[PDB]
From a paper:
Each subunit is separated by helical rises of 3.97 Å and 3.98 Å and helical twists of 41.2° and 40.83°, respectively, for SPFMV and SPMMV. Coat proteins from both structures contain three domains; an N-terminal domain made up of 1–123 (SPFMV), 1–111 (SPMMV) residues, a core domain with residues 124–276 (SPFMV), 112–262 (SPMMV) and a C-terminal tail comprising 277–316 (SPFMV), 263–305 (SPMMV) residues. The core domain consists of nine α-helices (SPFMV) and two β-strands, a feature which appears to be conserved amongst other viruses in the Potyviridae family. Interestingly, the predicted structure for SPFMV CP showed a largely un-structured N-terminus, supported by the high b factor in this region and suggested reduced accuracy in prediction in this region. The RNA segments are bound to an inner RNA binding pocket, formed by residues from the core domain and the C-terminal segment of the coat protein. Whereas SPMMV VLPs were readily purified and maintained integrity during long-term storage at low temperatures (4 °C), this was not the case for SPFMV VLPs, where particles were apparently easily disassembled and/or degraded, likely contributing to the much poorer purification yields.
Sweet potato feathery mottle virus (SPFMV) and Sweet potato mild mottle virus (SPMMV) are members of the genera Potyvirus and Ipomovirus, family Potyviridae, sharing Ipomoea batatas as common host, but transmitted, respectively, by aphids and whiteflies. A common feature for all potyvirids is the structure of virions as non-enveloped, flexible rod-shaped particles, composed of multiple copies of a unique coat protein (CP) helically arranged around the RNA genome. Here we report the generation of virus-like particles (VLPs) by transient expression of the CPs of SPFMV and SPMMV in the presence of a replicating RNA in Nicotiana benthamiana. Analysis of the purified VLPs by cryo-electron microscopy, gave structures with resolutions of 2.6 and 3.0 Å, respectively, showing a similar left-handed helical arrangement of 8.8 CP subunits per turn with the C-terminus at the inner surface and a binding pocket for the encapsidated ssRNA.
Numbering used by the authors: 91 to 310
Write the structure that this text describes.
RNA sequence: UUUUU
């Protein structure tokens, strides 16, 4: 008495013209990563374009970017990846402090800069645990949110990506800090258009006329 | 979706 193996498909199906459109053979093997089909982060083409833009502006090569990306990621952990950031971002070269401009780093991000840094969310999460083994390390973003749980330091930056299995109680904490940080976020599409209104005067000026025009139909 | 500095 062998054991039968069950496999179910079809059932309802779209059936646009009497036959199914879904390729169930391909659907069985089509199991991509959740972050590869999410619209909350930049695509591979957009991320690749951003990478070359930073190279052409800073002038460093591939090995230089590897060092810079580590410093930039740490800076983005402490300081949020807001589109309004300006000035320079700093990294420690052993003992001295070196600064790099922020403006060229924001120009080549086709989507918002937070989507670009979302690609570093998995690496950034591992960085916090590496720091939180012998010392209490809390990112400045988590300090500004008044998060009193040091165990939930893995999730203390604004470019963190939610996962199906990685967070269990951190989902509630991460969303609460997002709501607190976005309590007074204005959303205006337009504002201060480039037109200055005013008007245009098209009238000839002659010595025989007055400041504006001649006087007619006036008696006295 | 964005908006978290």
């Amino acid at each position: 008495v062998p054991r039968v193996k069950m496999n179910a498909n079809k059932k309802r199906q779209p059936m646009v013209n009497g036959r199914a459109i879904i390729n169930f053979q391909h659907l069985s093997t089509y199991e991509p990563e959740q972050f590869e089909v999410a619209n909350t982060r930049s695509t591979q083409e957009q991320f690749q374009a951003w990478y070359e833009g930073v190279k052409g502006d800073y002038g460093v090569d591939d090995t230089g970017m590897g060092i810079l990306l580590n410093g930039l990621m740490v800076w983005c952990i402490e300081n949020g990846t807001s589109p309004n950031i300006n000035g320079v971002w700093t990294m420690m070269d052993g003992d001295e402090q070196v600064t790099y401009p922020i403006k060229p780093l924001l120009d080549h991000a086709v989507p918002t800069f937070r989507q670009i840094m979302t690609h570093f969310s998995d690496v950034a999460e591992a960085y916090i645990e590496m720091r939180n083994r012998t010392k209490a390390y809390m990112p400045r973003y988590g300090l500004q949110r008044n998060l009193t749980d040091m165990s939930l330091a893995r999730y203390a930056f604004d470019f963190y990506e939610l996962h199906s299995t990685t967070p269990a109680r951190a989902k509630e904490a991460h969303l609460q800090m997002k709501a607190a940080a976005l309590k007074n976020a204005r959303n205006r599409l337009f504002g201060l258009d480039g037109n200055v209104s005013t008007q245009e005067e098209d009238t000839e000026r002659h010595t025989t006329t007055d400041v504006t025009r001649n006087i007619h139909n006036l008696l006295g």
